[PDB]
Amino acid sequence: MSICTSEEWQGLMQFTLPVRLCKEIELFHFDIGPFENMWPGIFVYMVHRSCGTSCFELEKLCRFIMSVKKNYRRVPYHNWKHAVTVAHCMYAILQNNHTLFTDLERKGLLIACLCHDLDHRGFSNSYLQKFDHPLAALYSTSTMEQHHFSQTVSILQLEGHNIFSTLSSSEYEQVLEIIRKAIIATDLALYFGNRKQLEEMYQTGSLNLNNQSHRDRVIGLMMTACDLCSVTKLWPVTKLTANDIYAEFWAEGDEMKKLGIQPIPMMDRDKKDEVPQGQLGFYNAVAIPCYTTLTQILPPTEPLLKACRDNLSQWEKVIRGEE
Ligand SMILES: COc1cc2ncnc(N3CCOCC3)c2cc1OCCNc1nc2ccccc2s1
Ligand SMILES: [Mg+2]
Ligand SMILES: [Zn+2]
């Protein structure tokens, strides 16, 4: 477990957020990218606004973040930057649907978004299973996603890092099930079944938000909506984030080609030309259905569907030779 330092903690505790951002952060389309030095500060602020100021002991909270950052590897996409990106969309979702959720779910989900891809190796579940990796042996399904929760807990157990010190064991075991379910749900393999049922719930008007099974499903989707939110940004930010993604995908494809095995077209850098078409398929199969059903259940999240459709037209244009 990579532990943080004190001068990192002393610099972050004396962090104001510039007043121009105070308005900007609240918006769904907000792009954190240009404020790398402000991300630990931006997450502290987001936790502060959603769960209240005096919620976590700020010594611990600040300590928890910089070790979360240290336990993200340097890889093209699934990194510290990504985690904070995913955390902001959740902040925006939670802010615009506040009383729909509870202290422990808001505190739990924001942390879980920040922790949701901890120590990602730039490898998908297919790979790790296809080559009998240690992690795939210990976790048969949702392979990385279970390791992420395993890692999330390992950080909480560290010296003065347990930000849930002031929770009763009841609350503490409640909050770890919110986090675990949320982190497992980011496994896209599960989303498809999750979204299918939530649409059938929604269409035959029987979703009840204080029905406990529906909460975990609705929260399950929210994590997918947060994980995929590069598609909900402005067009240039999306084109740039798609590169970061494919650079991780093709990295994974190179390793296959060293082992003498054809990678899937998504992970072949020698199929760059199909990128325009491949995004279109993901947008129609995954993204649009994700944010349509979310907007249906939480109407204040409509700007996610809005911007998703904007970036669908852009990929539609790129295939139609008008980039
Ligand atoms: C915005 O994009 C993505 C975002 C993602 N965010 C999270 N998880 C993902 N995956 C889902 C897949 O298993 C690993 C995890 C994501 C996949 C994405 O790419 C869209 C798919 N691209 C394709 N490019 C090509 C190129 C040639 C032929 C076919 C295709 S399909
Ligand atoms: Mg993941
Ligand atoms: Zn993720």
Side-chain angles (χ1 to χ4, degrees), residues 115-129 131-135:
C115 301
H116 85 277
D117 283 326
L118 271 166
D119 180 37
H120 206 294
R121 289 94 192 285
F123 287 102
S124 81
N125 295 329
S126 268
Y127 180 103
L128 297 164
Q129 288 153 21
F131 302 115
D132 314 315
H133 186 259
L135 290 168

Side-chain angles (χ1 to χ4, degrees), residues 85-86 89-90 93 113 221-229 291:
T85 303
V86 174
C89 193
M90 187 52 81
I93 290 164
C113 279
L221 182 72
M222 285 158 53
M223 294 296 289
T224 306
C226 285
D227 198 19
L228 308 181
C229 73
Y291 302 114

Side-chain angles (χ1 to χ4, degrees), residues 30-44:
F30 186 73
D31 177 25
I32 61 153
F35 317 104
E36 191 172 43
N37 79 143
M38 301 185 161
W39 297 340
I42 278 160
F43 181 76
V44 166

Side-chain angles (χ1 to χ4, degrees), residues 143-156:
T143 297
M144 285 311 311
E145 288 78 37
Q146 284 183 257
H147 180 79
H148 298 319
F149 173 64
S150 175
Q151 284 272 305
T152 310
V153 171
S154 297
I155 293 175
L156 290 169

Side-chain angles (χ1 to χ4, degrees), residues 187-197 224 282 285-287:
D187 183 4
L188 248 171
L190 309 179
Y191 149 83
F192 296 106
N194 185 245
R195 189 263 162 196
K196 177 225 173 77
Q197 282 291 319
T224 306
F282 188 73
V286 202

